[PDB]
Write a protein that binds this ligand. Structure first.
Ligand SMILES: O=C1CC[C@@H](NC(=O)c2cscn2)CN1
Ligand SMILES: [Cl-]
Ligand SMILES: [Cl-]
Length: 163
C-alpha cells in the first residue's frame, strides 16, 4: 500500500499516467471503442485479448507486466436511472477488488459513465461519489484523470472538502 494513501486529480490523457496500473472505461465487448477506451486501445492493445465482460464488472488483462483493469459502466441511454446507478456503483466495487488483488501502490482511474455513456447528463458527482465509496477502503494512491478544465476544478474541490 501507499505510506499515506491519497486522492489526486490531473487534467491530461490517462494513456500518459504515472501510476502502477490503469482503469479503462471499457465497453462490454472488448472493442477499441471511442474516448478514453480508444486511447487505452492505442497505448495497450495487447490488453484487449479476451477483455469482454458484462456491465457492472471489471476484468484485468496484463500488457507486458502493466495491468489494465477493464471496468464496464452502464450506458444511461439504455438503463433506467435506478438500474444504471446500481451498475455504476457495482463497476467501481469490482475495480476496488482488482486494485487490492494486484497489490499495486497506485492506480489511474477515469470517471465511469461520464462521457458517451452519460445519456447526455452531467454525472461528475454521481460517478465520483461511487468511486469514493469503493476506493475509500483501499490503500492505493488514486489519481483521477479528466479532460475538462471545469471538471478538474470540481473534482479537486470534492477531494479537498473531505480534507
Ligand atoms: O473532464 C471530463 C469531460 C467529460 C468526460 N470526458 C470525456 O468525454 C473524454 C473523452 S476522451 C477523455 N475524456 C469526463 N471528463
Ligand atoms: Cl495530454
Ligand atoms: Cl463513458
Amino acid at each position: 500500500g501507499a505510506m499515506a494513501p491519497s486522492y489526486r486529480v490531473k487534467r491530461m490523457d490517462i494513456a500518459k499516467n504515472d501510476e502502477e496500473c490503469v482503469v479503462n472505461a471499457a465497453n462490454p465487448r472488448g472493442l477499441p471503442g471511442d474516448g478514453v477506451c480508444k486511447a487505452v486501445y492505442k497505448k495497450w492493445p495487447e490488453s484487449f485479448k479476451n477483455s469482454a465482460t458484462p456491465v457492472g464488472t471489471a476484468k484485468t488483462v496484463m500488457c507486458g507486466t502493466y495491468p489494465v483493469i477493464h471496468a464496464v459502466g452502464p450506458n444511461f441511454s439504455n438503463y433506467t436511472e435506478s438500474e444504471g446507478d446500481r451498475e455504476l456503483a457495482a463497476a467501481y466495487r469490482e475495480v476496488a477488488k482488482e486494485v487490492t488483488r494486484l497489490g499495486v501502490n497506485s492506480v489511474a482511474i477515469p470517471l465511469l459513465s461520464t462521457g458517451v455513456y452519460s445519456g447526455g447528463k452531467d454525472r461528475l458527482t454521481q460517478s465520483l461519489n461511487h468511486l469514493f465509496t469503493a476506493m475509500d477502503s483501499t490503500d492505493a494512491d488514486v489519481v483521477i484523470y479528466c479532460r475538462d478544465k471545469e471538471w478538474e476544478k470540481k473534482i479537486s474541490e470534492a477531494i479537498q472538502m473531505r480534507t
